[PDB]
Amino acid sequence: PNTKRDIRRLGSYPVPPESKNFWRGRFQVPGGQIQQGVSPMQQKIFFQWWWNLPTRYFWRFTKWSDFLIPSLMWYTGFLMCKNDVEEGTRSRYWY
Amino acid sequence: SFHRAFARVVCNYNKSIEGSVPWYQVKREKSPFQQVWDEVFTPIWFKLVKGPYERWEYNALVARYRGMGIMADDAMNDKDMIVERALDIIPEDIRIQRYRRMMRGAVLAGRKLHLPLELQNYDPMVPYMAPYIEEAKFQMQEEQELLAYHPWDRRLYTAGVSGFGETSMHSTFLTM
Amino acid sequence: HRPTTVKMIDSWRTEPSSEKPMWYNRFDQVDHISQHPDPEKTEKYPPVDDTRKLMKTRGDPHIMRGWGEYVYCHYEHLREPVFPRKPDVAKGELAAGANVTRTDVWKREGEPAIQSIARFNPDNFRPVGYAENIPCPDTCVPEGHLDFRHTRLPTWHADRRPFHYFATGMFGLIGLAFLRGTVVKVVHGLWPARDAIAAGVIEVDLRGIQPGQNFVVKWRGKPVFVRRRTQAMIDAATADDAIVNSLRDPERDKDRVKKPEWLVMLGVCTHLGCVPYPDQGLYGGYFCPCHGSHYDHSGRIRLGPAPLNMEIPTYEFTDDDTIILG
Amino acid sequence: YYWGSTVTTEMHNVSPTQVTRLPNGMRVATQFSYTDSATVGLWIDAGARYETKESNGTAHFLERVLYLGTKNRSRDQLETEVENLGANLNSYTGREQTAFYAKTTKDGILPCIDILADCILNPKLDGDEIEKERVRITQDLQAVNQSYEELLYDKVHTACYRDCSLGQTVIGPEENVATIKRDHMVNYLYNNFTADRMVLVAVGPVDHAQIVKEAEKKFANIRPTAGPRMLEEKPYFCASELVYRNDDMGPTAHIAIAYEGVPWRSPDYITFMLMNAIIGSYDKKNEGLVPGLQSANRITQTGATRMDVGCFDYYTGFNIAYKDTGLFGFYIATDEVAVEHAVGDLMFGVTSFSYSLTEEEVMKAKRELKTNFFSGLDNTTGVAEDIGRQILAYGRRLSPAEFVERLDQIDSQEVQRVAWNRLHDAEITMTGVGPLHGLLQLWDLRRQTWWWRY
Amino acid sequence: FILIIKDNIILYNINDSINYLWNIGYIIMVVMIVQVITGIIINLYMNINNGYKGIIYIIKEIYYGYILRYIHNNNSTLIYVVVYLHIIRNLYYKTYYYNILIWYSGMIMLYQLIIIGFIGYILGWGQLSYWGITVIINLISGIPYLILLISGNYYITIVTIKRLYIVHFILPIILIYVEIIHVYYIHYLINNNIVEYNVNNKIIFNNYILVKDNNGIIFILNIFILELNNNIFIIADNDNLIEINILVTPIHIIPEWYYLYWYSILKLLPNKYSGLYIVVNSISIINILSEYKIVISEYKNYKNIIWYNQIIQYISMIYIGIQLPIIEYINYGRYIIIFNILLLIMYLYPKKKK
Ligand SMILES: CCCCCCCCCCCCCCCCCC(=O)OC[C@H](COP(=O)([O-])OCC(O)COP(=O)([O-])OC[C@@H](COC(=O)CCCCCCCCCCCCCCCCC)OC(=O)CCCCCCCCCCCCCCCCC)OC(=O)CCCCCCCCCCCCCCCCC
Ligand SMILES: CCCCCCCCCCCCCCCCCC(=O)OC[C@H](COP(=O)([O-])OCC(O)COP(=O)([O-])OC[C@@H](COC(=O)CCCCCCCCCCCCCCCCC)OC(=O)CCCCCCCCCCCCCCCCC)OC(=O)CCCCCCCCCCCCCCCCC
Ligand SMILES: CCCCCCCCCCCCCCCCCC(=O)OC[C@H](COP(=O)([O-])OCC(O)COP(=O)([O-])OC[C@@H](COC(=O)CCCCCCCCCCCCCCCCC)OC(=O)CCCCCCCCCCCCCCCCC)OC(=O)CCCCCCCCCCCCCCCCC
Ligand SMILES: CCCCCCCCCCCCCCCCCC(=O)OC[C@H](COP(=O)([O-])OCC(O)COP(=O)([O-])OC[C@@H](COC(=O)CCCCCCCCCCCCCCCCC)OC(=O)CCCCCCCCCCCCCCCCC)OC(=O)CCCCCCCCCCCCCCCCC
Ligand SMILES: CCCCCCCCCCCCCCCCCC(=O)OC[C@H](COP(=O)([O-])OCC(O)COP(=O)([O-])OC[C@@H](COC(=O)CCCCCCCCCCCCCCCCC)OC(=O)CCCCCCCCCCCCCCCCC)OC(=O)CCCCCCCCCCCCCCCCC
Ligand SMILES: COC1=C(OC)C(=O)C(C/C=C(\C)CC/C=C(\C)CC/C=C(\C)CC/C=C(\C)CC/C=C(\C)CC/C=C(\C)CC/C=C(\C)CCC=C(C)C)=C(C)C1=O
Ligand code: HEM
Ligand code: HEM
């Protein structure tokens, strides 16, 4: 569950037995907030995928480029071993 | 629609039997055939079978109550709802002695003992609960009629209760 | 709290926070929390247009040393000594915790001690620059980001409920079809297998049999006598066909044979299961030697302990010289 | 099912409402009553809806300043004169309708017509009065100074009617209130307070001819008409959430859930009135003769049982109608931890209208609907509101007998048909204030408008 | 138990910001059910006296018995792929840092799964099955008379198959029970998020997360059906279709692909016991990765270099297992083992202060 301060309830109505987990994830919101939304039945349901598509893949690739140098080094190890194996076999067996 | 026609038939029929006297409140004369059967079978059957068998069972029941030192009305189980509703309203003096008699009986029965014969000369079939059983039945019949005349729809498995009618939380296996 | 643990220990190799703070140790101290600047009303740094023009950070990239995975953080769990190093609040160092209580940094010269210790309340210390750096979001959806105000359909649009329920219905439609196929296929596997179904059908090549010969075919575990009947045998059963109702189990030869020349019967005595032997008994039919049951040329019980007639299996004639049992 | 007619002879024994149209186009409606007091006023077709976004709030400002002096009188003289007659001038402004009426004694009926005419036709919108009222309106505009019921009533309109003027609030935004001036108010008077949009309603010991003669004399110089209102599409109902999550305002949470309703003149409006009565209202602090645990109202009874404590500190249904749209729903004030049970139970109750509504509940509701309506017509001001509101809404006043005749036809099957067409599997709007961790997403609540059973 | 279902499915709250990598656990639970169901059905027809002839009988004679045979074999491959990906997921986000009880409950299911899969492979009763168990069982030849008690004879026989079959039938049922302890700890100890901190953006599971989880599990099903019916990937070695010959060894003796990592560890280290112990080290050492840290941080959302090297290290070790025991491969494999030890030490060690 969340912190004791967060899950401390203001109301005295008992927690229903089917909502135990729901009220253990309560948060104590400081300063209030305004939440707004619209039913999906009155919205475009696929455009956001297209609108966010290029930025999603740009940030994905720039993060994954951090593994470029490690992967090249492992790949360099993969090549050396493969060709060290071939030379060893030929030297030991081939005439 | 056939349901509409059926609904009208039900309405007309029930309207035609409003105020009918219940079968038990009619002054009924036995048919010339039931009178003959009562003249022949019933007397012989009582003398030879029913009378002796039922006296044998009744006298045994009186002895069992006297051995436990309890009254017949003590033997009622409070798992029955009418008994529970009646026990809510019995006066305290009746309640105290009822509890003491029932406790003594269970001790005697559990230890396989019987009440001393000095204490057994009483009539166990005195109906001390009758006024309160009748009040409880009246209260329950009013509630049945004015508040439970239709199968009501409620949201299911919410607030610890199945939603099918029971009023206590966690009182079924599927509400654990 | 649930079972939980903190690493509040005395390390052998890592100093405590009082000895070596890992954060930028420059804070501004006030006399009352209300004297701090208000970040919402405090001007922030001038916005930049290039990611390369963004300001520098105060963190030290190399604050921690030694083997292990890289990490930058300001705090640890280690225990402090009862006599902690005296913080230099004059230069801006933070004084909170043991370095206040178990030290004399709070002491001024002529101020009442009650007033002096009141200033060193943790609420009176805020990092230098708190009001000019900390973000103060006005919304969780910054300008330029898509929200419901951009995705709302035009007011002349068409109902979207019908298609939505078609899509969720199609999920159920396909799911139910896959479910039915799975269930039926599993139950189907319990049907007699291909080897068993194949073995449960024997074809009788009536070609090569001679009149009066009896042969046995093992069909579904039981002996199935298939006898070609000579005219004498056929006539014999026909003669008893008139004396029917004088037999333990009255049956007519016409109702036990599809073709008079051919008698196909299960060779199991109706008394106790022994297999009768042909051309034996009083009727030249089939005599069970176990307890002495005599059957006629039609397979009807005529004498002995047996109660009923030998059963006629399910069999049809494919052609004139072939039968199919089953 | 049809159970007969509930119209009685007493329903026909009511004085008729006489409505005449003056040549300028002002309707004059009167009903005689055997009373020593009367109510005379002008119910005008005007309000916040007919204001533009920049000028929103002008109508409310004008209503507050109209009685603060006229060209002929002064605020002190006007207040003194009304007091000498033993009367009291009242007024209100709404989204679609406005009223300026006077409760008076019999001798003050005609004098009050003069005062009300002078205020409406010759308002002296003094700058000092405007500036003082600006301070009062500005304080009223603050949310801290508004009740939570008032806040939710405005926010329901803001959320439901994002595309049209019905979403505007009557008081207006603080930016407009800061800038309103006499010219704004003078324009609003000229454009909206015209004869074709006014109804003079007199209820009491009144004679129709005399009221008509006075009305024609005092309202002779009113502007006959203004240009017809712009033609607009059906107000679009936006299924949306507008929830103010505040955990620093105490334990009680206030929630309002709305469905799209029907306009005033809809054939289904009376059905929606009955459905509003079936939902009913409940208060833990005013339970009435019948306790919640044994209530005939199904929503109330199931609610009282939840957790052995009850999941409704207060709730009420609401049915709001406008010329071309309406809102139907319920308002709840309940403990924070009870909100999921409360919204779930009051939504299950509305969904039940489409599936399983008993004749018993309908017939009880018809009687309590009739009791509410008839009891409202007891005093002259109640009658005057009814005459004025109805003539504006319908162009005529429905008689008590006609209301009962039409209500007799409505039965459980009719409620089921209307609910199945309009409320079943319908779009909803949720609005809220207070600690609302228990309130689920709009889509989750919108799935409770239909049942897996039946 | 309808109020327990409602508290853990209907009104269960999860953060909105989770990725599709949080759908892996749901996939494991569903495919696990399928593997148990298809196993029970397969045993209605299977012959334990000759597993080789039972498989042929199911594939040829039973109606749609090929579906049962291939689903059970291929779904076992899918169980390990999804479980290993779940392990990689947990390592990447360091979900073990605070939810260690969830990590412990999971590791138990991992240990059970290893035993379940291996014995099942033996039930095929082919060349690799017989020779694989013969090689592995010899690792415990040090403990006196332990091999005889386990095998029930002096060589692997149907006696061994009968007893291993009971473990294969029952142990998966116990694994399902441990899945309830795993879900209990997940629901009590709230799940981690893609961000380090805990934020107020949770939504109910049934209406949102379950729809997304079904989309993922249906996407994996489109791939599993292609493999199931057309064998686009070789996931079962062909050598297990050769009849057992106790006198002749097969060309190579290797387990399924999902045991290759541990197989190479043994093949690499010279001493047999050392190989077994290094196998023990790899699974146990990852249970205490965060235990020695002292700073207030979960090391989350850095560049995760050590993580990536470790994942590639698993892949390379799996690759070396496939190859013959060439000397050059042995040398490189040993370097990888040393490299892996250094990576783990980086995880364990706390940092000093400059
Ligand atoms: C003793 C005193 C005297 C006694 C007298 C008795 C009097 C009664 C007898 C006479 C009855 C006359 C009925 C007149 C009917 C009028 C028809 C008419 O004009 O229509 C208006 C009429 C009503 O219209 P409406 O006014 O709009 O009202 C709508 C409501 O339906 C209105 O209904 P509702 O709202 O009232 O609700 C009830 C509803 C619904 O009521 C029920 O369904 C009752 C359900 C109760 C539970 C039952 C559980 C199951 C019990 C099984 C027991 C089996 C026992 C076996 C024993 C064997 C051993 C003995 O009833 C009906 O729908 C009426 C049925 C009318 C007759 C047609 C159907 C009869 C059943 C046929 C079954 C055939 C089985 C064949 C098997 C073959 C096997 C090889 O139209 C209908 O709705 C009727 C049709 C209903 C559906 C029937 C099935 C149709 C199948 C179509 C197949 C298409 C295939 C296409 C293939 C394409 C391939 C490409
Ligand atoms: C030759 C060919 C022939 C072909 C022939 C074909 C024939 C086809 C036959 C089709 C079936 C016909 C069955 C007729 C039964 C009539 C019984 C009767 O007179 O009832 C009056 C009786 C009223 O009694 P009462 O003393 O006047 O008042 C009752 C209360 O004390 C006080 O009452 P209250 O009204 O004051 O209390 C309020 C509450 C009272 O509520 C209740 O009474 C409910 C009681 C608890 C129900 C739940 C029990 C727990 C779950 C059991 C199942 C466990 C395993 C399930 C999953 C297994 C998966 C492997 O009422 C309501 O809530 C009203 C709305 C109820 C519907 C709600 C819909 C959503 C829930 C869905 C479940 C209920 C559906 C309706 C019942 C279906 C009956 C079959 O009502 C019931 O019996 C209630 C239903 C309880 C039984 C549910 C059985 C479900 C099916 C189980 C499998 C059965 C297999 C065996 C063979 C089935 C074929 C026969
Ligand atoms: C002439 C021919 C005649 C033929 C004769 C046969 C006739 C056919 C029909 C026979 C069956 C009738 C079924 C009646 C259904 C009644 C439903 C009902 O009302 O239930 C509630 C009702 C409770 O009443 P209530 O308290 O008023 O309800 C209010 C509460 O809301 C109620 O709520 P509550 O909670 O208080 O009570 C609910 C109660 C209801 O349940 C019961 O009481 C039992 C009901 C079902 C009975 C069993 C049905 C079995 C038949 C189907 C299977 C056949 C397979 C065939 C295959 C063949 C293949 C070759 O308990 C439960 O729901 C327990 C559920 C436990 C489930 C545990 C599952 C395992 C854990 C979860 C899953 C696994 C873990 C996850 C793993 C994941 C892996 C990764 O149940 C009962 O009181 C009756 C129980 C049954 C008594 C015996 C019935 C006898 C029937 C008469 C005929 C018998 C003939 C002789 C048979 C001989 C056999 C050898
Ligand atoms: C003929 C052969 C016969 C052989 C006989 C062998 C008999 C051996 C008997 C052993 C008996 C069992 C001992 C178990 C002790 C359990 C203690 C425990 O659980 O304490 C928890 C306890 C919990 O404390 P806490 O307060 O909750 O937390 C402390 C805070 O985290 C922060 O605390 P702090 O800040 O105060 O720091 C204290 C400091 C204190 O640290 C120390 O004092 C420990 C220093 C250990 C250094 C080991 C270096 C080995 C270098 C070998 C070089 C060979 C050169 C060959 C040259 C050849 C030339 C030809 O700790 C640290 O800095 C971090 C410690 C991290 C520990 C990680 C544990 C990993 C264990 C598994 C490693 C191996 C598995 C992978 C490889 C397997 C295959 C090869 O931890 C401590 O208090 C720290 C104890 C750390 C002990 C680590 C000992 C590692 C020893 C490795 C031996 C390797 C031998 C290689 C030989 C090679 C020969 C060629
Ligand atoms: C826990 C994790 C999960 C675990 C899961 C479990 C895992 C376990 C382990 C795995 C075990 C191993 C096994 C795994 C297997 C997996 C694979 C699998 O299952 O594969 C199965 C299966 C593989 O294929 P298959 O099974 O070989 O194919 C079988 C055949 O296809 C079809 O089958 P069939 O050929 O055998 O049967 C065909 C037959 C089947 O036939 C039927 O069933 C039809 C007959 C039903 C009759 C129902 C009658 C009901 C009413 C009875 C009467 C009631 C009376 C009541 C009265 C009451 C009165 C009180 O239907 C027809 O022939 C069709 C025509 C039917 C005409 C019916 C006409 C009715 C006339 C009625 C007249 C009545 C009048 C009476 C008047 C007189 C009255 C007195 O999968 C599929 O096929 C997948 C299909 C998916 C859906 C495809 C469709 C997609 C649509 C896309 C739409 C979107 C595009 C829209 C485009 C729009 C363009 C604009
Ligand atoms: C030779 O080539 C090689 C291979 O291919 C052959 C490899 O696969 C591999 C890798 C292989 C592996 C890592 C796995 C190998 C697996 C093997 C050998 C399995 C052998 C069979 C068993 C261990 C079955 C015995 C079963 C158990 C001990 C239960 C296992 C699960 C456990 C202990 C977890 C918790 C305990 C339980 C679930 C048991 C529950 C107990 C009960 C319910 C008892 C209740 C009793 C009462 C009285 C109430 C290598 C390294 C290799 O070199
Ligand atoms: C996570 C659960 C399980 C997995 C990983 C698994 C794994 C496997 C493996 C890999 C095979 C051999 C594949 C092949 O023949 O090449 C097998 C065979 C078998 N399994 Fe399972 N199994 C599991 C659960 C079960 C269960 C619950 C049962 C029975 C209730 C079962 C019964 C069988 C049977 C009878 C065979 C022999 C059929 C065969 O040749 O495939 N399995 N198992
Ligand atoms: C039979 C195999 C297992 C199944 C059925 C399974 C199932 C689940 C499911 C349903 C979740 C919750 C949703 C999710 O995060 O995807 C989860 C969470 C988790 N599992 Fe497993 N698991 C299995 C194996 C393992 C193993 C072997 C480990 C550890 C090496 C593990 C560690 C975890 C952790 C740390 C979490 C927390 C996820 C988080 O905090 O976000 N699981 N698992």
Q: Quick one: which atom of ligand 3 is closest to the CA of E32?
A: 80
In this structure, what DSSP letter does residue C154 have? Answer: P
Pairing of strands E13-15, A33-38: unpaired
Q: Quick one: which atom of ligand 3 is closest to the CA of B173?
A: 35
Pairing of strands C262-266, D27-32: unpaired
Residue E73 near residue E36, CB atoms below 8 Å: no
Closest C-alpha to D407, from D372, D375, D362: D362
Residue A36 near residue C148, CB atoms below 8 Å: yes
Q: At how many degrees (to 10) do helices E210-230 and E24-42 cross?
A: 50
The beta-carbon contacts of D148-152 under 8 Å, at least 24 apart in sequence, are D148/D254, D148/D333, D148/D433, D148/D434, D149/D254, D149/D331, D151/D244, D151/D254, D151/D433, D152/D254, D152/D255, D152/D256, D152/D331, D152/D431, D152/D432, D152/D433
Label residue D241 exposed, middle or buried (CB < 10 Å: 0-12, 13-18, 19+): buried
Pocket probe mutation, ligand 2, options B81, B164, B166, B172, max atoms within 8 Å of Cβ: B164
Per-residue burial over E105-138, b if 16 or more Cβ lie within 10 Å, else e, is: bbbebeeebeebbbbbbbbbbbbbbbbbbeebee
This structure's resolution (angstroms)?
2.2
CA distance E249 to E128: 9
Provide the β-strand partners of residue C294. Answer: C287, C303
Q: How was this structure determined?
A: cryo-EM
Cα B132 from chain centroid (whole Å): 12
Residue D35 near residue D205, CB atoms below 8 Å: yes
Residue D81 near residue D126, CB atoms below 8 Å: no
| Nearest listed ligand to the Cα of residue E114 | 6
Q: Is A28 near chain C, with CB under 8 Å? A: no
In this structure, what DSSP letter does residue C193 have? Answer: P
Closest C-alpha to E313, from E342, E292, E284, E290: E342
* Residues D192, D198, D201: CA angle, nearest 5 degrees: 150
Residue D185 near residue D124, CB atoms below 8 Å: no
E1: nearest CB among B160, B162, B174 = B174
Contacts of E244 (CB under 8 A, 6+ apart): E52, E125, E126, E127, E129, E130
**D217 phi-psi bin (left φ>0, alpha ψ -120 to 50, beta other):** alpha
Provide the β-strand partners of residue D283. Answer: D286, D314
Amino acid at E307: W
* Residues C207, C210, C212: CA angle, nearest 5 degrees: 135
The strand order across the sheet containing C262-266 reads: C214-219, C222-228, C262-266
Residue nearest to ligand 3 atom 43, measured at CA:
B173
| Nearest listed ligand to the Cα of residue E15 | 8
Shortest distance between the Cα of E210 and any Cα of chain D, in A, equals 14
CA distance C298 to C279: 12
CA distance B31 to E135: 97
CB contact under 8 A, B157 and E6: yes
Residue D424 near residue D416, CB atoms below 8 Å: no
Shortest distance between the Cα of D152 and any Cα of chain E, in A, equals 24
DSSP collapsed to 3 states, C56-125: CCCCCCCCEECCCCCCCCCCECCCCCCCCCCCCCCCCCCCCCHHHHCCCCCCCCCCCHHHHHHHCCHHHE
Residue nearest to ligand 1 atom 12, measured at CA:
B2
| Cα A8 to Cα B167, D440, E23, E324, distances in angstroms | 29, 19, 31, 63
Residue A68 with chain E: CB contacts under 8 Å: none
Amino acid at B160: G
CA distance D21 to D24: 8
Ramachandran angles phi, psi of D99, nearest 5°:
-145, 145
For residue B4, the chain D residue with the least C-alpha distance is D1
Residue B129 near residue B90, CB atoms below 8 Å: yes
| Cα A38 to Cα D162, E223, E336, distances in angstroms | 11, 36, 55
| Cα B43 to Cα D26, D126, E28, distances in angstroms | 97, 111, 79
Q: Which residue in the block uniquely carries the two structure tokens 């779930």?
A: D344
DSSP symbols for E200-234: S-EEEIIIIIHHHHHHHHHHHHHHHHHHHHH--S-
DSSP collapsed to 3 states, D156-214: HHHHHCCCCHHHCCCCCCHHHHHHCCHHHHHHHHHHHCCHHHEEEEEEECCCHHHHHHH
Task: For residue E86, report the distance from its CA to the centre of ligand 8, in Å.
Answer: 7
Tell me the three state secondary structure of residue D274: helix
D63 is a catalytic site residue: yes
Q: Quick one: which atom of ligand 7 is closest to the CA of E42?
A: 35
- Token digits of residue E127: 């060349």
Shortest distance between the Cα of D236 and any Cα of chain C, in A, equals 7
- Token digits of residue B76: 């009622």
- Token digits of residue D288: 């009435």
Pairing of strands E13-15, C285-288: unpaired
Residue D330 near residue D257, CB atoms below 8 Å: yes
Provide the β-strand partners of residue D32. Answer: D204
Task: For residue B174, report the distance from its CA to the centre of ligand 3, in Å.
Answer: 13
Amino acid at D187: N
* Residues A19, A21, A23: CA angle, nearest 5 degrees: 70
CA distance E290 to D199: 81
Task: For residue C3, report the distance from its CA to the centre of ligand 8, in Å.
Answer: 20
- Token digits of residue E191: 């799940």
Which residue in the list D10, D51, D54, D63 is annotated as catalytic?
D63
Provide the β-strand partners of residue C215. Answer: C226
Alpha-carbon radius of gyration of chain C: 53
Task: For residue B3, report the distance from its CA to the centre of ligand 1, in Å.
Answer: 12
CA distance D44 to D116: 13
Q: Quick one: which atom of ligand 4 is closest to the CA of E292?
A: 31
Q: Is D36 near chain E, with CB under 8 Å? A: no
Q: Which residue in the block uniquely carries the two structure tokens 């002259």?
A: D380
Shortest distance between the Cα of A61 and any Cα of chain C, in A, equals 18
Query: Torsion angle, CA of D294/D295/D301/D305, rounded to 10 degrees?
Result: -30
CB contact under 8 A, D443 and A39: yes
D163: nearest CB among C148, C155, C161 = C155
